[PDB]
Each structure stands twice: as structure tokens, then as C-alpha cells.
Design a protein around this nucleic acid. Sequence first.
RNA 1: GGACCUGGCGGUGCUUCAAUCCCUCUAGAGGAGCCUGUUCUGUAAUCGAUAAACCCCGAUCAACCUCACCACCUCUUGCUCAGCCUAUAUACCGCCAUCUUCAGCAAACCUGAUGAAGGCUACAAAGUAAGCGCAAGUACCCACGUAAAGACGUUAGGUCAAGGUGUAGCCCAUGAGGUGGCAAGAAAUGGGCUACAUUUUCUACCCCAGAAAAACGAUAGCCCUUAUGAAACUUAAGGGUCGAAGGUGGAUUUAGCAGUAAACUGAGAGUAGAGUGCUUAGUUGAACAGGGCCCUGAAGCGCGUACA
Lengths: 331, 303, 132, 63
Amino acid sequence: SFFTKLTADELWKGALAETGAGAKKGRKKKRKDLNRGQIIGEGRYGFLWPGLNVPLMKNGAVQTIAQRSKEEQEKVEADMIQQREEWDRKKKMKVKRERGWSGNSWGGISLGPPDPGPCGETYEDFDTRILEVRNVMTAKSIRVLVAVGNGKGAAGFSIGKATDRMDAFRKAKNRAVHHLHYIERYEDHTIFHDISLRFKRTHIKMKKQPKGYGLRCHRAIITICRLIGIKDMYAKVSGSINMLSLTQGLFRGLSRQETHQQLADKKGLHVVEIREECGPLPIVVASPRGPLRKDPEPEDEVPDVKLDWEDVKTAQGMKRSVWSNLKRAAT
Amino acid sequence: TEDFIKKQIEEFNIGKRHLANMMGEDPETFTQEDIDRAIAYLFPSGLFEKRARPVMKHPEQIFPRQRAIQWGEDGRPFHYLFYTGKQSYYSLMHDVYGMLLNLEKHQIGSRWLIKEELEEMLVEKLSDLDYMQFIRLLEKLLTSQCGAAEEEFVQRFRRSVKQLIEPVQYDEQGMAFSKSEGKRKTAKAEAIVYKHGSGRIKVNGIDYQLYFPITQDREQLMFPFHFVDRLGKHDVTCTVSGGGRSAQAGAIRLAMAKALCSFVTEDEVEWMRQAGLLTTDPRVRERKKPGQEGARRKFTWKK
Amino acid sequence: KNRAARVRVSKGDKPVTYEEAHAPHYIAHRKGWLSLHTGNLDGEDHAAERTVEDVFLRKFMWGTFPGCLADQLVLKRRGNQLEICAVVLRQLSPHKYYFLVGYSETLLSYFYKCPVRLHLQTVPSKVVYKYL
Amino acid sequence: AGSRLETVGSIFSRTRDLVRAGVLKEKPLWFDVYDAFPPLREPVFQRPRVRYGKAKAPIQDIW
RNA sequence: GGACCUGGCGGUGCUUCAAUCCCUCUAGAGGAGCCUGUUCUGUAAUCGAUAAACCCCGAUCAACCUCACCACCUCUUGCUCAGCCUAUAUACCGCCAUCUUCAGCAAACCUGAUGAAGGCUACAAAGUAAGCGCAAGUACCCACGUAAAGACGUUAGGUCAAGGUGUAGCCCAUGAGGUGGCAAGAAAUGGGCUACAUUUUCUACCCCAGAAAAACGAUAGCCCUUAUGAAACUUAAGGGUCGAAGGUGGAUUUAGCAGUAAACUGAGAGUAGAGUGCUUAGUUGAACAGGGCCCUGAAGCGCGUACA
Ligand SMILES: [Mg+2]
């Protein structure tokens, strides 16, 4: 009966059955829009109605009512079937994820640029990388740690909480963009000096490195360094490796690091650099803004720096870790 | 924005001129009320809600002020207390504080406007504690020997909290009388009470005792005249229709009391009104509700 | 819980129109009738035929203008005429619009034995009255 | 877009660093005035610490 | 293994509470009969509903039809570009119930040295919150009350037999058509009507009277007739007949805060006809409203259990 038929929207609602007692607590079907490829005025009889499914005129002459030949209608049906199957195949086929740290992990996955700000603020220049995803009693939600960075020193990190993973990501990145640090970089490729820090119970030891050395760091640190714009550095993480603690300590140390210009101004002396690749040539990297000291400055015969036993062991060669220096993909 | 509002003002003026032309009314003297009448006629709508019906008003009345952005083109807020978030409320508080300081240096009729009234006045959203603070400050302003210059301001927040004497008509013979009416339940009664009479009370052309065979109804009829001690001083003609016997008695009693008001002094009228003779009864039968036997009788609770 | 002619709340991403946003009880208070005829009036007849005509016309138009009607269809029965007023998207070509209008006019008129007019008002998109 | 890390550096330091980064499209209104007339102490955040040992408050009494 | 955070649980007491938990006011159910629904038995022979939230419920209603049941018989592209009242409500849409006689649900934003987590102080100390709901607004006769509304979730709640539909299966039959038929009662139970009377019975009348008074008391049973209809033991109505049980009722227990209860009388839905059912209009029209918390449930004061 004609009067019993229902609209496609209601039919699809009933078929999909998204809302239901089972769906309430998780105790698949695809909404194929059957009206996508349909053209108004097309019927199985292949009637060319002028002005609806065919041009109104022809060579300046009004077209009349016509019917496609049997073979022509068959060809039209075959072409429609071909288009339908091509669309279905293209829908079925999937593009592989841009795998993160692991196949089944969210770590390292890029979330794209942060959402634009209201007052004409854009952030297309900022890349966003996930670092951690966790589940969290409800009468369960998702927590996320993400980082954002412009690749030119301005980077930040944030946490997000949401019942939905996508909402958590959106919150985390939109909040990170408002918590940017500015990590000063030496020659725009590496930190200014070795940094040894302890946050909570996570020790981070970062070493400056020459160009091309690459990033040899904990994968999270690699992600953060890529976001910041650091191309070469070494980093050893010890103690508890809680991801949030690691991120917070890394950012703390990087922000607190000291520039050559700042050191030169503080100590009232030229900062001179010596390179093996340049032999004895002294390179004045930074000079004080104020008057330069005539005082030759103390010649500390023996330093009191708190050396790292692991660093000394590596230097003396007693370190024989089979894992150290294992060849690894470009970082 | 302000330019948008000005454009709407111009458009509304042009529409007003269109309407005046359409109705043939002088646009110069064409008023808001005339616009109202014409639009009502031209767009007949049967919605119960006065808001859901069409409207063509001035943009001022039409649009919500939406707090007017509060910052001009430059971006500087207009109100110095703007950053509070309740600029008008706090402006009023500051003004009342100043008036209290000035008064301190120098030295059953109404109530306060309700919190919603104050919120509408200030076009601002307040809280209960905000209303309490404002009202207490106002009360202190009262108690501080508020003079006329201050009482005038206060009365801007105050809210104020008699039976009609019908004309004494005359018959062809010149005999004075007063006519009144009253309805009870489904009964209606029109009573004519004569200034002078021997207590005769004819109902539907019938003597009262005959028409009302129940001494209770007779007592109802007697109640007003007994209350004012005017029994036997008035002749009454009461035409009643509809409803049951008690409803008819009540309607006739109400009509007789109202008619007698015109003949009894104002103090007597006030006394009757206090007693309840002159107050129309709001008690009416409550309609049966579906799924329950009576207006409140829930069907026997099954188990 | 009343499931009848209501749009359940969602995360706020579900746009809805005036009709879909108003529930039945508000009928005759905030929203009027989508069909205006004299059948159901007191002492009149042919309420059933008016209802059948309304249902048939609504289904006919919905199937004729797939993904084109941006609002429900308002039917008016003045005298014996019929007026179908529609809000349609500006997505289908004007030539197709006019042809469909004329065809439906003529066919419905011949079918029900009464003049019929279709009046389309076009919009860039379905008028969102709120989001749910 | 200004960094909301009030515990890291000063307002001037953070704004200057972000501008240098280019993340800040243009210097805020007060930056030039601050640069021209910096306060005697940079408003860096610092957590107060309670003296424990023999260290004493250097505030001398008046006599 | 250590230190922490949250949810759950008591057979957890004190204090507040609730037509409103118990008492308190009125009227009733259970005791008798009848109408009616359900369960068990029976039947060749009806599906669903099933503690509150089934039980004159789907049904605004079954003599055939209705009808989906049984028995028998018959048809094969079948009214339908077939069909299926056959399973699956533990797939759903559609429509609802329950708390709800609630007020909270909430997206989106903004401290714990950025851990699980938290977000209160008005002489205010980090919360703002769109939107939904209550509210507000609207109908009725007010500004009252009743209606209406009543969000998110709760019971895999119901409904595949309103209809649509995922899924399952039948296609010489799980589909379609015609004729005939139970619709009963050991026994229990739910609801309703009528009574047991003297504030009654009965007439007149619609409230100023005269009789009845062990008679009161069946709408049941029997016979006859009438209305409907093709068909009346089937339904309803009218007359006669008979005058039965019973003498205010056990476990116990329902409803009501005022034009309410209670009583009475009309009208409407649906059918050819069919209810003591339902809906609805009106008339007369009151009593208590104050105590407490063992019992129920809701809180705060909180206590102690303990697993996720
Ligand atoms: Mg894998």
C-alpha cells in the first residue's frame, strides 16, 4: 500500500538501530544514501522528459517525449551499476594510518594544526603530536597528553579529559596553544648546553650535539624536539618514565636553559667557542652588552662540577652496553 | 549593532508609511496604536499567545537590548563599572550608597518591587543575595529620615497594594430603585431593589418562600438585608436562571447584596464586603480528569 | 518518557527546525496547522477524505522533490482550490524546479478534480531554529 | 595567544620570546612602554621560602 | 610491596521529614449474590499483557464476520512486480510505563608545584556555563487549582498481533479461500454493580403527606414477548415468575485535604445490536488537618562494612 511507505530517513534510523537497549551499554551497518546517484526524471522505462532529464532544446528545436532503446537503457543501467560499485569500493578501501610509535598506540600520531582562535588567530603553522592516552568511577572517560609546536622554538603541552577521544584531543591541543614556552635554541638546531634535571622521580640528561648528530632520545623526547625545532641532541631518561613527568621536566629544563648572550652579559666577558673542525680559530659567539671586564676572571684550577658516573664511564670506555649506539632509523 | 538598529529604524518608518498609505490614514498622524490595529486586521492570526502572533513595531521595542555590546567601536566599554559583569546593578548600589552618605551627613500602603521586577528594571540578571542586599540598602535609606528628594527616588521601587455604587434609577412612577446582577456556579441573577419597600421579594414573578421551598435558601436570601438591618425596608424583584437550587440562591443573594449597596451607606457597603456578601464566589466545580473518577478521585488503586 | 514527535537531546551538534523543535502539546499555541481545510470543523463532512488527500499529497511531494524540500509542506484548501507551499533548497536547477512544479500541478489537479498550485520559496539551506 | 605560564619568566620575557618566535602577530600595547621603562625588578614568579636554620631576617630594628 | 584517589555496601543508629510513612476524619474492597478479568482443570480449539509498572488490560468492546484458534475441505505466479498474525521487543523505528506525588541533566570553557582527582565560604575565598527540564508560558473560570508539561538515566520493562523494519525460516504452504465449533467450571483471586434496610420500602411530589416494616434483599434462574440482525440458547430490552444468599462482614486493606470524598442523575465513543466497562456534564455536598517514626520510604548528622 502506498500510504504505508515511510521516508528514507526513518527507514535508515530503524535499520541502523543506533538507539536501543543493547546500544545503551554495548551489551555494524552503514547509512547508504540511496538518493546520491539518482537523477530526477530517470526511470526504468528510460523516458527522456524534455527539460527535466534531457536538454529542453536541440539545435534550437524543442525536444519532445522519447524513450531510450532497449540496448541504450541497458547500457545506462550498466553504467549506473558500475558507478555504484566504484563508489562502494572506494568507500570500502581505507588509507593506512600514519602509524605512531607503535601500530596499536596513539603515541606520536599527528593531530594536525590547532583550531583557529576567535579573534582572527590562526595556528596552521603549529604541528600537534599526541604523547599519551589513558582510560579513567562513572555511575569511563579518556585522558590525553598532547604537545604542539611551531617548529621554531615555540612549543607547549597540555592535558585533556573527555568522555570522547576526539573531544579530549580537541581540548588538549586548544589548551596547549595557550601554554606555549619559548625554548631558546643554539644555532636553531640544538640546546645551548648540557642539562641535567630531576622532576619528581624522572632524571633527564640532555647533551648538546653538533649538527647532523640527529636526535638520540626517548621517543617522546624525539617528538617534543621535532615540535620545538631541535634537530640534534642526545637525551637519557632514568628513573620512573611516567610520560607526563617526563614531558613536564623536559619543558622545565629546556625553558630554564641559559643562552650564550645571557651568560656573556652576566659574567662580563666574551663567550668564545673552539671547534675541532676549525682548529685554533676562536669564534666569539656572544659578547656582553655592558662594558667588558678587564679582569682575567678566575682560572679555576680544578672544577667542582658534579660529574655523571655514566658519562665518565662512557668516556673511559668501561661502558659496554650492547644496546648503546645500535643503528636506528633516521630521527 | 547601532548602525543595524538605525537601518531597522529607517525600514520600520518606511513600513509605517506603507501601512498608512494602504489604510488611507495620514502617515504624519499615523500612530503606533493605529499601526497595531491595521496589522492585526491585515494578518488575522488565531494564536492564543500574544507573543506568537506577528508583530511590526519600532526596533527599540522589538529587539532585545542585548546589553548594547557595551564597548564602542574603539573597544572601550561605556560603563566605568563594566568589568564587574553587573554594571547596572552595581551602579545602582553605588548611587544608593552615595545617597545614604548624603543623608547621614545631613542628619499598609505599598511594598517593594519583586526581584523579577528589579531584574527587568535593571535589564540585568541578579541573584537572590543581590536582591536582598539591594532591598536592605533601600530599607536603610527609608530609615535614614529620607526626605522628599530621597523618597521620590525610593518610590521608584515601591509597589502599592471598593464596591462600585450603581446609579439609583427611577421607574415611570418616579419610584427610585437600583439594579444589579451576580452569578454563582452556573446560576445568574438580576436583582432590582427599591429604595422603599415592605420586604416583598418576588423571584421569577413568584414569592420567595414559594419559589425556594428550603429554609436554607430563604436564609440565604435574608442574609444581606439582615446584615444591614434593612429587612422590610426594600421590595426586591429577582430574576434567576440556570444551575441548581443552591447555586440559584447564591446568585440571588449576591445580586441582592450588590443592589442594596447603592442604598446602604459606604461604611455599610464596606462591612458587607468584609463579611463576604459582596465578594463573588470563585468556588466552581472542578472538571473531571481523564483516568480518574472525579476531579481528584483517583480510580481504586489496583494491585 | 514521551517518544512522540520530539527530538531527543544530543551532544549539541544536531540542528533542528521550527517544527522539529516544537512538540505536539504546543500545537495551536506556538505552532499552527500544516493543513488548513474545513473538513474537521463542527457540522462539516469529509474529514477522512481531507486526511487521505493530505497524506497522499505529502508523500507525493516528498518523493517528487528528493533532498530538495527544506521544510514541511503547508496545504491550504480555499473553496475547492488547493495550495501547496514548500520551502526548497537552492540546490536543484531552476529549469528542473519549474518542470516539476508544472507537472505536479497538472497531475494532482487531474487526479483530485480541483485546481492546484505549488508555491516554492527557496533558501540557501534548511533554516536552523536551534541545535541539539 | 599569549603564553599563560605565569610561573615561567615575566610577562615581558614571555611576550618578547613569543614575538621573537613570531607566534605573537604584533607586540601588545604595553610592550614598548615596559621596554622603555622596565621596573627595578623583573616580575619573575618566585615561591616564598620559610627560613629554617640560623639565617635571620635582615630587617634591622630602629633605635 | 609502599603511599594515595574514587565508586560501591550495612541486617548502621540520632535529627528532620512525608491524603502524606503510622495514628488521627470520611467513604469503601474482602463476608452474600451478580457483571467482569485472570490462573488451574477441561477443550480438537485464541496471541499478547504478568510485583509496584498484569488482571472490564490491547478491546471506544467476539452470534457468522471480527479472528489471528481448532476440525474438515479447497487453491497454486496466488489483490499486491506474491505472501506469511511464524521465531527474534535480548536488533530496532513507532508509542508508552516506573521513579516523576523528582530537579536535575548538561555540552563548551577556566587549581592539584599539570596524578588519580578538585572547584564551596555573600562582611564571599575559582568558578562561568550555552542548551534541555522544572520553572516560566498556555487552556479552562482568577493572579488559584486542575490540566498540560515532566529533561538524562532505571528495570535487555512491554509492544514484531497497529504499521514499518534488521535478522531467521516456509513458498504444493509456516501462504490464500469456504463451511462448522468450545468460549465451560473442582478452586482461587483482581476490579465493578446490588444489597443487607428505618437517614429504610412506596406512591405523589421534587423536599410541610399516607401506607410498608422480618419485610428489605437478583440486572441471577425459568417461561413468554419485543429491538437488532441472514441467523437470539447466543445480545439487549419489556412483562410474569420465582423472593434465594445476606443481616455490615477474617486474614487484612483502598481512596480522598473542599465544591474534594460520598450519593444521585444525564449525555458521548464505539455496533446492525451488544458493558454493571470507558469518557464526560451537572446537582446536593461534608469530617479530620494535629500527633509521632517501630513499619515504609527521602534526606542531613554521620558511623562502620567492605569489594570494583
Ligand atoms: Mg600491529
